[PDB]
Write a structure and sequence with these properties.
Family: Belongs to the BET family.
Order of helices and strands: HHHHH
CATH topology: Histone Acetyltransferase, Chain A
Radius of gyration: 15 Å
Shape: globular
Structural class: mainly alpha
Organism: Homo sapiens (Human)
Subcellular location: Nucleus; Chromosome
Strand content: under 5%
CATH superfamily: Bromodomain-like
Helix content: 40-55%
Bound molecules: the ligand Cn1cc(-c2ccc3c(=O)n(C)cc(-c4cccc(NS(C)(=O)=O)c4)c3c2)cn1
Number of strands: 0
PDB class: gene regulation/inhibitor
Protein name: Bromodomain-containing protein 4
CATH architecture: Up-down Bundle
Number of domains: 1
Length: 125
């Protein structure tokens, strides 16, 4: 079976709005969502559908943009870095599971370049 997706709401964590978290949802997630390379990253990797039975043997911290969107909308992160770390995990999962130069890896690298361009414009803490 696929594993259940990552946790996205936790009723026992404190909640806040910050400049950075707002920007992460309204600008960074939005911009990446619409990129031509985004669709394989928009929901968890469906290892059953793709016939990739080793994916969740290899990738033990799955992450995707659907889950990040949900964490942001549910105020799951207190610090912007937690969200930034989730985007990084999503990219590195793709680099760990696949091989250098793979086309799916080039698609991740392009999304990652864009993500860094938007993170450089994060508003002041
Ligand atoms: C032979 N083969 C390999 C793949 C493959 C290999 C690695 C990846 C990968 O690392 N990511 C993050 C995503 C995909 C992928 C590609 C196309 C569609 C989907 N759909 S999904 C998000 O429902 O799992 C996922 C993906 C697909 C597909 N066919």
């Amino acid at each position: 079976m696929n594993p259940p997706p990552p946790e996205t709401s936790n009723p026992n964590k404190p909640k806040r709005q910050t400049n950075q978290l707002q920007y992460l949802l309204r600008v960074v997630l939005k911009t990446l969502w619409k990129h031509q390379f985004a669709w394989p990253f928009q929901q968890p990797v469906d290892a059953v559908k793709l016939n990739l039975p080793d994916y969740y043997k290899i990738i033990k911290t799955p992450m995707d943009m659907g889950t990040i969107k949900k964490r942001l909308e549910n105020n799951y992160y207190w610090n912007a870095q937690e969200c930034i770390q989730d985007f990084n995990t999503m990219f590195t999962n793709c680099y760990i599971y696949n091989k250098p130069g793979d086309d799916i890896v080039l698609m991740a690298e392009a999304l990652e370049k864009l993500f860094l361009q938007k993170i450089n414009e994060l508003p002041t803490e």
